[PDB]
Amino acid sequence: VLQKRPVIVKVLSTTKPFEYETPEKKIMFHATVATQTQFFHVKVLNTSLKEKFNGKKIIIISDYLEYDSLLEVNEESTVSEAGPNQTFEVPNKIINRAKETLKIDILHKQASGNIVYGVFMLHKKTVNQKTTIYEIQDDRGKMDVVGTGQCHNIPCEEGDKLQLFCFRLRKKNQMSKLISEMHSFIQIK
C-alpha cells in the first residue's frame, strides 16, 4: 500500500546499479538515507532515479512502499529535490547507527523472518552449481549465508569483508542462516 507521508532525507550511501533475478532480469540499486532523527534502507527499483540519489542534494521521497523495516521506491514513487529552506545536517550518531552491524551470536537469537544488512568477514566459501554458501564469522560466532542469483558466485577470498544488503534471517531445523532473496546484494567492503 502506497505510503503517503513524504520523507525529507539526506542520502548517506548507494550501491551502483545491479542486475537481479525476479520470479526475468531487472536492474535496481540499494540506498541508505537519513533524516535528522533516523536512518532508512531503501530499495530503489527505478534506476532512472540514480542522479537524485547521488547525494549532492537533500531529496523528498513520496508514494513509497514500507515493509521489512525499509522503503521501496519504484516506478509509481515520486522523488524530488528539496527546496532551499528544507536543508539540514544529520547527526554523527545517526550516520554511525546506519552503519552498525549486529554481532553473529545476537543474530542467532533474532526472530526468524527479520531482514539483515551488515559487514561480515568471510571464513569459508562453497561454490555449487546454482547456490553459494558463504560462511561468515566474527569474534562471537559464525553463520551460513545462502546466495542464489546475483548473490551466487561473487568473487571473494577468505579474509575479505562482505557487505550484505537485504538478506532474510531464516530458522529451519533448529538452525539460523541468512538467505538471499530477489533484492539482496553482496559486495566486498
From Swiss-Prot:
Description of post-translational modifications: Ubiquitinated by human herpes simplex virus 1 (HHV-1) ICP0 protein; leading to degradation by the proteasome. Lysine acetylation in the multipartite nuclear localization signal (NLS) regulates the subcellular location. In vitro can be acetylated by p300/EP300 coupled to cytoplasmic localization.
Q: Give the domain of life.
A: Eukaryota
Question: Taking every annotated instance into account, which residue ranges of this chain make up the domain HIN-200?
Answer: 1-189
Q: Where is this region: Interaction with TP53 C-terminus?
A: 1-189
Recorded consequence of changing Y20A: Abolishes TP53-mediated transcriptional activation
Q: Which cysteines are joined by disulfide bonds?
A: none
Which tissues is it found in, per the record? Expressed in peripheral blood leukocytes, fibroblasts and lymphoid cells. Present in myeloid precursors (CD34+) and throughout monocyte development, but its expression is down-regulated in erythroid and polymorphonuclear precursor cells. Present in prostate, ovary and breast (at protein level).
Give all N6-acetyllysine modified positions: K16
Family listed: Belongs to the HIN-200 family.
What is the protein name for this chain?
Gamma-interferon-inducible protein 16
Please tell me the species this chain comes from. Homo sapiens (Human)
- Whichever gene encodes this chain, its name is IFI16
Q: Which residues of the full protein are shown?
A: 199 to 389 of 785
